[PDB]
Design a protein around this nucleic acid. Structure first.
Lengths: 136, 192, 107, 93, 50, 72, 77, 195, 121, 99
RNA sequence: UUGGGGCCCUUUGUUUCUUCUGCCUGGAGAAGUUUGACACCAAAUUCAAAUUGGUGUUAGGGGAGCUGGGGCCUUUCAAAA
RNA sequence: AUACUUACCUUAAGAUAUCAGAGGAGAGUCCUACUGAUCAAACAUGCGCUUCCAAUAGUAGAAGGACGUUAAGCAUUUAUCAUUGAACUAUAAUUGUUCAUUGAAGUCAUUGAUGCAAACUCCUUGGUCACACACACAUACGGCGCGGAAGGCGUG
RNA sequence: UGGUAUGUUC
């Protein structure tokens, strides 16, 4: 049922249970990275959690929590073990990850906006009334 | 006590003819007024007669099937009448204090100065002056806004809601005094 | 006339303690509460020839590698079954009971 | 007199706590009103017997001597009972 | 977990989201039905004889 | 020292558990500062049924907890 | 009705002199039947005409001062 | 004697009836809630950074790192970083306080809306709602609000409101978007929507 | 575990140490103490409760032992069903840093009393 | 008489009077006539030893302890000679004095 | 005062004592510091604003003066071989 | 914030280390900026003392875990009783075999539980420090650098 | 000789 359009409460509860039970801080990143590709109705809360968790990073070594190191070295041309002045290095990391998140946000925003403005803004009843009811 | 075993020993030592002055007759019948006002602000101190649970159980077993004693009931009636007379005197003193507060010198002077200026168009002006005098009297009465409790003789309020009033009625003083009024009314209904 | 004050005069005494669980504790005394909550240092404890609860209590204290060597153990009063003192100590001088002597002089 | 742990147990009234009994049954629920003798009352209680099964009581009241431990929430990590040098603002005469 | 009896506001209650429930496992000791000391302790008359 | 707060259990059916299984369901008539429980119309419940007289008093040492069987 | 404390409950149970079933500790312990004649603050209950029956052939016992730390439950048989 | 560590108020000999009434009064509630909020805010806001360990780096790492490039550091003034961190703090607290409430307003005309979603006829936690009403012993707290209660009882059946479209519903809320990335919305819609 | 616990310390001096307290069952609680009393009721921060199973007990009887660990967080344990307590791990900050922190707490408490005296006037 | 209402700081004299003329007549006779007693404990540890001191908690100091227990598997008796012992009154089942 | 070389800038609010200006072609400038000041939370007063209750910070290094203590050397007095 | 009403309560005590001697106060008790000894606390202080403090001449590793993955890894073990009907082994409250009506509770879990075993990844901690990439030792090792963390002993 | 909490008016 995890691909439901109005499943914001389910995924908020599941991320709450991961953030409360898990102590490794790895499964939360994985599930939220999965949510950043799913066309949900209440989706911008998960993007806001993603953007404030990128802001809540502490060092470069947590970038392996996002992806693998070879995908960072090939696609973003960035190394984890690059030692030196890591201030603007981490700032450029945040800017490039914010650009990738913004592009995927445009994709998911176009999908959700299309589904809402064409289809989901018309259906007013989503429940089982009775065998005697009438639907317009 | 600091240990509960000494408390249980105290309960045993106070739990374990019958017409003797040591037995409190108001407690032998039930609901002694020196017991219903033990630790409150209206406390009478300490009862000089002793209270016992075994004598109370024997009196309950006697009044269940055996017999009844009218002398202890008459003594409890006299004690309840004396306490009701003292509480009625306290309520009359509270009513006299409320009447003196409603009839103060400066308040009556301000009311007379407002009524001296209170005197079709003249009738409308007199009605407006009477409404202004009623508003001034309501503002003077709202400085305290303390009523008189009809049963327990305490102070109440009219603008106060029913929840704080219900918190007022559930006290030791009010429950004890309503029980004493019920006992006094029952004894006056039995005697008359 | 509590004999915990007798154990309060037994600082730096190298004793053993058999507990109610069955564990023998060899170590030096540091201090003892008046409620007989005794602390010990330079400790080795052993469960002799069984009680699986006592074996769990023996192993799950860190420092096993069934003699378990531990640096500092506090022992509660109700878990103490008996305590064996060294025979070289003179019991006639440590049991003088100066509080009892002052109580007898106050009479 | 009372001490710090009974004041901490009286501190977390109206919060989701988890008890364990001496038999092995673990309770979990909202603490109604704790006492100095630790005879504590819980509400919306979920219970786990030592046999293993899980049940639900509405309003439990356990005696203090049959309690292994109880878990308070983590925001009571920082409490003024834990302060060592908190002075006392003029106790009354 | 959603609606509470608590006198505290919702901003306090979001700070008072409690711990997850405890993972139960099988006990190790004997139950309180079996908790007792040793029976059949013999008399001390054999020590006074031999 | 302190009287336990059993005032809410005044006229409600409770179920005491005794020591691992003895579930005595009764009606609480009174208590003390020792958690000694007075029960009217007691009933032993086993996982069968057994009646325990009209009134009974139960020692607080064997009492572990009590379930409020009736709504408050 | 009202509140009945356990000390007054045992006191009324003493006055009425009903037949008494006194329970005790678990499987080692043995259920006793008798009639109460005296008690105290540590619940050391004195009973008379005592017949003991083990947990599921009773033997008479006489008069017994049963101590407090083993008393579990008191019923009126 | 008893001393409240929160309210900094003393007391007489320790009575349970006085101590129970002390934890109900509104001043103790305000001081306790503010103290818990400030201690939680302090343990969140305390940036316990790691103690840095700088070693004498290798030679070839120095010839590789000092020849690749030199990056540019961005930095802002005091009022700019203060305003940005204040906006980030209000965004973090409004994300910590919010929750998705689409299932409550999306099943509003359901026949079992008065048995689960009403949160007062609930079975397991409805007695907790019916127990502590905060009984408003002040008359001003009861005389302040003059709106309707709209308390939906459990006994509401399917006979009431048979057709959910004739009784005027609400159009559902649009999917909210981030205001910092609102400039990339498709400005041209697919279909013509009026009003 | 080469910690070298203090040779003349008591419960007032062992505070904020990562204890490894043993009970009658053997359910070992590991965590920092923050308070005690006369009955030795110990609050335990970030506590974990470890046991051994019944199947592991046969291997423990005369190597690796798979203990069962549950996480309790901040708990408050009673002094009745406990047997012994030891010191397992030292805390984070040192004795001099705790001394500077205690001096800062004393100065802050004196400043708070001066603020209460200023507000009382 | 209630314990809390007797007196202040004179309860030790009543405790000594109960020691001389109460149930403590056997622990007093063993420490003044140095006779060996047999204490049976709550875990089959029977102790033959002489009494050195008396306590309100029956905490007893024993000298020249000969203790004996029985392991039941099969049936063996294991004994041990301990010079000095401080026995807690919790473990004591019974104390027998020989004439 | 200038210039060169080496390291660090995670100080992630780019020094974190605070406020203001301001920064990677740089690492800065001005003011203040325990009956005070700074930042924040919560609220009813129907924007903002103002009032009340609390929370946390007021730091680190070096130098002149004073003082306590530890070790070595020198001068003088008393005592024992 | 002032003024007033109401609800509850109005307090277990004694003392602040021990021993010996001298003096004072009308056998017993109290005091001495009285004297000697022991012990405790605080602040300094030293013992060629005891333990620990992570490469950078590389892309590592020490301690504690994962409430992380491979992993539904491999090997084992359980997943309700009673009455009756059509046959029935049968000392049981027909237990055993196939099918069903009915009766009381009826942990979820069998991708479960226990044992065994390897690999990978990620978290918290440090002096990631000052000189040098060096020929010492039976009295087995020049512990004779600046410190920090824990502890022992000794002195004021 | 007092404390805690609550409700009105300025």
């Amino acid at each position: 049922v995890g691909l439901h359009f109005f499943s914001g409460e389910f995924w908020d509860l599941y991320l709450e249970q991961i953030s409360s039970r898990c102590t490794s801080s790895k499964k939360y990143w994985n599930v939220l990275r999965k949510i950043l590709e799913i066309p949900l109705h209440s989706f911008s809360k998960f993007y806001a959690l993603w953007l404030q968790r990128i802001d809540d990073i502490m060092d470069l070594k947590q970038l392996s929590q996002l992806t693998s190191k070879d995908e960072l070295l090939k696609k973003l041309k960035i190394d984890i073990n690059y030692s030196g002045r890591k201030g603007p290095y981490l700032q450029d990391a945040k800017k490039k990850l914010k650009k990738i998140t913004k592009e995927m946000y445009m994709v998911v925003q176009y999908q959700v906006l299309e589904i809402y403005s064409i289809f989901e803004s018309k259906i007013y009843i989503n429940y089982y009334t009775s065998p005697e009811t009438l639907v317009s | 006590m600091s240990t509960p075993a000494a408390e249980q020993r105290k309960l045993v030592e106070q739990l374990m003819g019958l017409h003797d002055p040591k037995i409190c007759k108001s407690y032998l019948v039930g609901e002694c007024p020196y017991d219903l006002f033990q630790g409150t602000k209206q406390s009478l101190g300490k009862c000089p007669q002793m209270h016992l649970t075994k004598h109370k159980i024997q009196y309950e077993r006697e009044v269940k099937q055996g017999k009844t004693f009218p002398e202890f009931e008459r003594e409890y009636l006299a004690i309840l009448s004396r306490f009701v007379n003292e509480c009625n005197g306290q309520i009359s003193v509270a009513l006299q204090n409320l009447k003196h507060t409603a009839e103060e010198r400066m308040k009556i002077q301000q009311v007379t100065e407002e009524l001296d200026v209170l005197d079709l168009i003249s009738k409308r002006k007199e009605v407006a002056k009477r409404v202004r005098n009623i508003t001034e009297n309501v503002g003077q009465s709202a400085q305290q806004k303390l009523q008189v409790c009809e049963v327990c003789g305490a102070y109440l309020s009219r603008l106060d809601t029913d929840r704080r009033l219900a918190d007022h009625f559930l006290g030791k003083i009010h429950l004890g005094y309503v029980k004493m009024r019920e006992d006094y009314d029952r004894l006056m209904k039995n005697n008359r | 006339m509590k004999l915990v004050n007798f154990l309060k005069k037994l600082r730096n005494e190298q004793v053993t303690i058999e507990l109610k669980n069955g564990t023998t504790v060899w170590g030096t005394l540091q201090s003892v509460s008046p409620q007989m909550n005794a602390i010990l240092t330079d400790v080795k404890l052993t469960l002799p020839q069984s009680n699986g609860i006592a074996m769990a209590s023996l192993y799950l204290t860190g420092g096993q590698q069934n003699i378990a060597s531990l640096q500092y153990i506090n022992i509660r009063g109700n878990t103490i079954r008996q305590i064996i003192l060294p025979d070289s100590l003179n019991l006639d001088s440590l049991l003088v009971d100066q509080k009892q002597l002052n109580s007898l002089r106050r009479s | 007199m009372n001490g710090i742990p009974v004041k901490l147990l009286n501190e977390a009234q109206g919060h989701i706590v988890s008890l364990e009994l001496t038999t092995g049954a673990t309770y979990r629920g909202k603490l109604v009103e704790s006492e100095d003798s630790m005879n504590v009352q819980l509400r919306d209680v979920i219970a786990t017997e030592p046999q293993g099964a899980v049940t639900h009581m509405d309003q439990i009241f356990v005696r203090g001597s049959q309690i292994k431990f109880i878990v308070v929430p983590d925001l009571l990590k920082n409490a003024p009972l834990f302060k060592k040098n908190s002075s006392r603002p003029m106790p009354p005469i | 977990m959603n609606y509470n009896l608590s006198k505290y506001p919702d901003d306090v209650s979001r700070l008072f989201k409690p711990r997850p429930p405890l993972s139960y496992k099988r006990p190790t000791d004997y139950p309180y039905a079996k908790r007792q000391t040793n029976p059949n302790i013999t008399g001390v008359a054999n020590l006074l004889s031999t | 020292v302190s009287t336990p707060e059993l005032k809410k259990y005044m006229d409600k059916k409770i179920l005491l558990n005794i020591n691992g299984s003895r579930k005595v369901a009764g009606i609480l008539r009174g208590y003390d500062i020792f958690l000694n429980v007075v029960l009217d119309d007691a009933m032993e419940i086993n996982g069968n049924n057994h009646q325990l007289g009209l009134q009974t008093v139960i020692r607080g040492n064997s009492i572990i907890s009590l379930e409020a069987l009736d709504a408050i | 009705k009202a509140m009945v404390p356990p000390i007054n409950c045992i006191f009324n149970f003493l006055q009425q002199q009903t037949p008494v079933t006194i329970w005790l500790f678990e499987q080692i312990g043995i259920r006793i039947k008798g009639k109460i004649v005296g008690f105290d603050e540590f619940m050391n209950v004195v009973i008379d005409e005592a017949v003991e029956i083990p947990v599921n052939k009773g033997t008479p016992l006489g008069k017994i001062l049963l101590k407090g730390d083993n008393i579990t439950l008191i019923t009126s048989a | 004697r008893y001393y409240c560590e929160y309210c900094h108020s003393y007391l007489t000999h320790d009575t349970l009836s006085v101590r129970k009434s002390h934890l109900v009064g509104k001043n103790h509630l305000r001081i306790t809630a503010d103290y818990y909020r400030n201690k939680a805010r302090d343990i969140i806001n305390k940036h316990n950074h790691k103690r840095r360990h700088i070693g004498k780096r290798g030679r070839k790492e120095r010839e590789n790192s000092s020849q690749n490039e030199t990056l540019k550091v961005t930095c802002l003034s005091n009022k700019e970083k203060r305003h940005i961190m204040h906006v980030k703090k209000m965004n973090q607290k409004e994300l910590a306080q919010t929750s998705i409430d689409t299932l409550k307003l999306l099943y509003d005309g359901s026949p079992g809306y008065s048995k689960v979603f009403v949160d007062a006829n609930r079975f397991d936690i409805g007695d907790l709602v019916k127990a502590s009403k905060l009984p408003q012993r002040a008359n001003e707290k009861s005389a302040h609000h003059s709106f309707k209660q709209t308390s939906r009882s459990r006994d509401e059946t399917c006979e009431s409101n048979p057709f959910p479209r004739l009784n005027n519903p609400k159009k559902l809320e649009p999917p909210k978007i981030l205001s910092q990335w609102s400039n990339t919305i498709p400005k041209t819609s697919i279909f013509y929507s009026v009003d | 575990s080469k910690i070298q616990v203090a040779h003349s310390s008591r419960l007032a001096n062992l505070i904020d140490y990562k204890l490894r307290v043993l009970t009658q069952d053997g359910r070992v609680y590991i965590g920092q103490l923050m308070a005690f009393d006369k009955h030795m009721n110990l609050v335990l921060n970030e506590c974990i409760e470890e046991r051994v199973p019944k199947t592991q007990l046969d291997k423990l009887r005369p190597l690796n032992i798979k203990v069962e660990k549950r996480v309790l967080g901040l708990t408050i344990l009673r002094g009745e069903q406990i047997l012994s307590t030891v010191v397992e791990d030292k805390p984070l900050l040192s004795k001099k840093e705790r001394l500077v922190r205690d001096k800062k707490e004393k100065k802050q408490a004196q400043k708070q009393t001066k603020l209460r005296k200023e507000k009382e006037k | 008489r209630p314990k809390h209402e007797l007196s202040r700081a004179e309860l030790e004299e009543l405790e000594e009077f109960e020691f001389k003329h109460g149930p403590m007549s056997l622990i007093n006779d063993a420490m003044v006539t140095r006779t060996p007693v047999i204490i049976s404990l709550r875990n089959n540890h029977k102790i033959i030893a002489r009494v050195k001191a008396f306590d309100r908690h029956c905490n007893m100091v024993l000298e020249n302890v000969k203790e004996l227990w029985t392991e039941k598997k099969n049936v063996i008796n294991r004994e041990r000679f301990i010079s000095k012992l401080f026995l807690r009154g919790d473990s004591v089942i019974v104390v027998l004095k020989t004439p």
